[PDB]
Design a protein around this nucleic acid. Structure first.
Lengths: 151, 125, 106, 51, 197
RNA sequence: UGCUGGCGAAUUGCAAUGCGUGGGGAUAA
RNA sequence: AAGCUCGUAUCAGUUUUAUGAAUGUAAGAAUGAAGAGCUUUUAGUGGGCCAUUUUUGGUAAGCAGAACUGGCGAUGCGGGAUGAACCGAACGUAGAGUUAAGGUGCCGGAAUACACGCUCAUCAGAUGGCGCUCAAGCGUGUUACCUAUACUCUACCGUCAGGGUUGAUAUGAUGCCCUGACGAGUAGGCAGGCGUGGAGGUCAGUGACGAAGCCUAGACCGUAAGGUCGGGUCGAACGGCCUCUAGUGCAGAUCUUGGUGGUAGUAGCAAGCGAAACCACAGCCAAGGGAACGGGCUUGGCAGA
RNA sequence: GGAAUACUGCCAGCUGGGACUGAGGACUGCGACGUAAGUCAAGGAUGCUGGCAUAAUGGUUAUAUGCCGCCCGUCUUGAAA
RNA sequence: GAAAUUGUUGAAAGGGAAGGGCAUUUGAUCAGACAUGGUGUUUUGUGCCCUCUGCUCCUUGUGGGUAGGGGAAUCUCGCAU
């Protein structure tokens, strides 16, 4: 900062692009079963919990069911199914954007997993076959036309 | 240097008509002068001709892929003209400079922060 | 167990063309079970992949992929225009092309 | 012009004294060697005569 | 939608069928037309018999042995009608035709395997009721093909060997229709119906 | 997986599909 | 091209009213254009054919002649299967979008669309081929779609036009800019550049630690002329810059000289020895490609070293 | 007698999905919103995130595939010849 | 020691034409940093630093070069760890 510009570079114009919070599509409401589409956990049924500051979604399997940890995911790489669960019993507010820094798995992450997942397992047991539904993997069979399919 | 995305318009070399068929006709560009020539009347399928439209953007002209303008250098004196334009220009050590003198040039250009386009020229380890 | 398929499979038909001129940039894609432009509107903007075996192993895999996007519809049949990064080889006229479900509108 | 440009000359020429940085942490086991084309054949055509 | 799509000429129209079979190739869609002989055209017989012979008088001058080879066998008669819409020269073609297989009748190893029909090429779905229309069979016969008989007979045999089959099968699905009919009503069922099944 | 269980999945970090040669020997042509 | 007055009310392949025997003169009529006239001088240019609209001469017909306006000429591009005369469209380099003319069975990108009727033909019909018959034909209507260098928008190149810019501009005011419009081209004209041999000047230039040259499935720059660099080969001079000068830039001339092929191990000598003529390039048929032009194209038949 | 509803047309009505582009470079101007303080979609893209050095990537040559491409020059004639 | 042209070897292609343009795949192949910090604090240790004593070239204050000692308990002023 104290070091003078040794070469003449042009300063930027005062750019007129104020950032605005992400407006998610209508189908997403906290406590919604999703289908992840890309990455390590592609074609998995995963519960949606919180919209984060970095325009992502905080999601959990839960881990006890399908082996999906407390992960972040992008909004566009998800199909949101209409089947909603109870979410109000879960304390999500502990973790945010800063939680997912990396500067073998830490014990703190495992403890946050189990505390949340037990507070979620209790509500999954209410509806029939929902536990089995989350353990299963999504796929398009012969005759499945996604422009027709209601999720 | 933060440079614009360098657009080239035409990467391919503008070769001459029938430069490939005959051997005596060079690949160096010459216009077709005859009135009955298809290249001159710009028929479909035939080779593309050099015209002013293919001209490079003024802001990004003469720039190498590194985003520097090329500049020939003979000796340490001519090198030290670019003490103020390290981000803009790049030292091109001339072809005929000996291996004895290049080690001297590369020592100075490394110190001044001048990017040399052709190091390792005549210089083993 | 059998199906791991998260893509709609469709054939790569041709390039965008007239009778005598073809633009190799824009490829025409038939998609399975798609009959109208109205059904094809769903697939607009979705990422495409052409997956194929190659001879030499590149990154611990003998299989390479060309990625691209659906741009728009093409005629009344549900045939769809598609621009890839590197254009499809033209040897692939009538080859399977994987159309994915990201990015999702739904 | 001369106000900020001599300020600018001074700036660059002071950060030319990054020479000392290169020359304190030198200790480099390389050094540029010329390849004179006479030697390039004294050490080619004599190896082929060696074999 | 199916690696191979065995078709059954029986009651089709050279041209239309063909055409549609054409497209299907140029778009990587293996095919296998069968019962070729029992194909169909349009217009009286005496017609196709001419609109052919003409194709027969063809032949090259100096050397008739190097000109338009007039294939009699139906399969072929039709294979031409097809190779006629398929650049059949540029590799893109060769690549096709290379995807075809027109048989006269229905020889293994297809006999044992499902087939289909191109609803957009049926005498009974394109030709105005009662209206002249060839039947390749005769047409071929009338102009060479020396086997209409063999296939013929050697055919009826196939229909048997099968017909017999079906029975066994039909007699099988007669049970199921019951198995479920009974096992129907119960619960687990009811439910399904609700969702639709 | 017809029904009921008990464990493991992470850190892949917010997408980048994840069967011939060149010589021997033996014997058929 | 330049100089002179002006920048206007100077006009216009146009319409209108006015006034006479399609057609004359005016407008305090419209519409468009800041591009006008007066000198003075300087290149190139003396080809027709087709089509349109008026007639004039004409008998089996065709047409023959005259005048008038276009098309090609100097001109690509989309379409008409293919084309001097048809249809659309006058071209800087691209990206995206929309269309024209023509089309959507397949070859062929695009509806084996929808709706009303008609048509059976012993070579229907619309045919370029295959093929087509409640059509893929005929007559008509309704939408949907396909795509050109066309139009729209954006960037970029250059040209032209208008303009800003100094008690000096964080770049050579023959600089740095801001705005808009434009881009075909033969003969010819004007202008800015690139290269070669030598001269003056300069770079206290490069150079046996390798100059010049030569290659190179090597790299970069310049629209291009070309310039620069790496690698290999080489062995002694050479280059940039500001200027000067000319025996200065090649594909052709039945070019000159030198060298080397195919022909050909052929003709030949009245297993060996060994040319020449000649040589744009190749050499399958059918059909169309208007023009006593089919050999390259279009559509078919076909085609194994 | 009682409402509609197509059809034509309007909205300086609302809410989405996709592609392409990001030119320019301190601030001046026309504005909107906010009582003000300010802020903003207002005289041209910013912010976050990932992939790297045995990288990432980019190129040359060789052929294949789809489409397109009459043999150059001179000299005639109306152009093809 | 160029090109035409010739042989060998290696690679590629070849069903009655090749060479060219737009685009891309495959095969072969070449590129791809003696890049290494930047900033803000903290030990010390030195010097052109503080301080004591000077000497010398010249032009206007807003000068330049260059010795002998001391001193870090003040000082980041610089450079080394």
């Amino acid at each position: 900062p104290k070091w003078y510009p040794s070469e003449d570079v042009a300063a930027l114009k005062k750019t007129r692009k104020a950032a605005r919070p992400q407006k998610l599509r209508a189908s997403l409401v906290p406590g919604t079963v999703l289908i992840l589409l890309a990455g390590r956990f592609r074609g998995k049924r995963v519960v949606y919990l919180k919209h984060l500051e970095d325009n992502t979604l905080l999601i959990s399997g839960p881990f006890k069911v399908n082996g999906v940890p407390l992960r972040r995911v992008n909004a566009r790489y998800v199909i949101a199914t209409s089947t909603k669960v109870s979410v109000e019993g879960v304390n999500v507010e502990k973790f945010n954007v800063e939680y997912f820094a990396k500067e073998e798995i830490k014990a703190e992450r495992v403890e946050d997993q189990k505390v949340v997942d037990k507070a979620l397992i209790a509500e999954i047991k209410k509806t029939p076959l929902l536990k089995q539904y989350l353990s299963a993997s999504f796929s398009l069979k012969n005759g499945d036309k996604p422009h027709m399919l209601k999720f | 240097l933060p440079h614009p995305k360098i657009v080239k318009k035409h990467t391919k070399k503008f070769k001459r008509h029938h430069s490939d068929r005959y051997h005596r006709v060079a690949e160096n560009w010459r216009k077709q002068k005859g009135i009955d020539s298809v290249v001159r009347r710009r028929f479909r399928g035939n080779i593309s001709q050099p015209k002013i439209g293919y001209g490079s953007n003024k802001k990004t002209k003469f720039l190498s892929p590194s985003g520097h303008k090329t500049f020939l250098v003979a000796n340490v004196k001519d090198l030290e003209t670019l003490t103020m334009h390290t981000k803009t220009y790049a030292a091109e050590i001339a072809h005929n400079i000996s291996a004895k003198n290049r080690v001297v040039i590369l020592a100075r250009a490394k110190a001044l922060g001048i990017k040399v386009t052709n190091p390792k020229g005549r210089l083993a380890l | 167990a059998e199906s791991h398929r998260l893509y709609v499979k469709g054939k790569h038909l041709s390039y965008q063309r007239s009778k005598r001129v073809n633009n190799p940039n824009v490829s025409l894609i038939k998609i399975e079970g798609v009959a109208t432009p109205q059904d094809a509107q769903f697939y607009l903007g979705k990422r495409i992949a052409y997956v194929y075996r190659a001879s030499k192993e590149v990154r611990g895999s003998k299989i390479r992929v060309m990625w691209g996007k659906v741009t728009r519809t093409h005629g009344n049949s549900g045939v769809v225009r598609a621009t890839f990064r590197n254009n499809l080889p033209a040897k692939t006229f009538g080859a399977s092309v994987r159309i994915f479900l990201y990015p999702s509108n739904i | 012009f001369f106000r900020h440009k001599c300020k600018q000359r001074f700036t660059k020429l002071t950060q030319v004294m990054i020479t000392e940085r290169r020359l304190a942490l030198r200790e480099e086991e390389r050094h540029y060697v010329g390849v004179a084309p006479k030697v390039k054949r004294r050490e080619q055509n004599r190896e082929r005569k060696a074999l | 939608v199916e690696p191979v799509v065995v078709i059954d000429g029986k009651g089709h129209l050279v041209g239309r069928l063909a055409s549609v079979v054409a497209k299907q190739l140029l778009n990587g869609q293996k095919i296998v037309v069968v019962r070729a002989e029992e194909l169909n055209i349009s217009g009286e017989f005496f017609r196709n018999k001419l609109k052919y012979h003409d194709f027969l008088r063809k032949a090259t001058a100096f050397n008739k042995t190097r000109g338009p080879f007039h294939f009699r066998a139906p399969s072929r008669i039709f294979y031409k009608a097809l190779r006629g819409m398929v650049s059949h020269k540029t590799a893109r073609g060769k690549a096709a035709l290379e995807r075809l297989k027109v048989f006269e009748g229905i020889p293994p190893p297809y006999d044992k395997k499902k087939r289909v029909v191109v609803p957009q090429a049926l005498r009974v779905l394109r030709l105005k009721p009662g209206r002249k229309y060839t039947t390749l069979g005769k047409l071929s016969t009338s102009v060479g093909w020396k086997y209409e008989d063999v296939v013929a007979k050697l055919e009826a045999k196939r229909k048997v060997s099968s017909a017999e089959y079906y029975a066994k099968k039909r007699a099988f699905t007669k049970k199921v229709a019951s198995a479920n009919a009974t096992a129907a009503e119960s619960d687990v069922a009811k439910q399904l119906a609700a969702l639709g099944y």
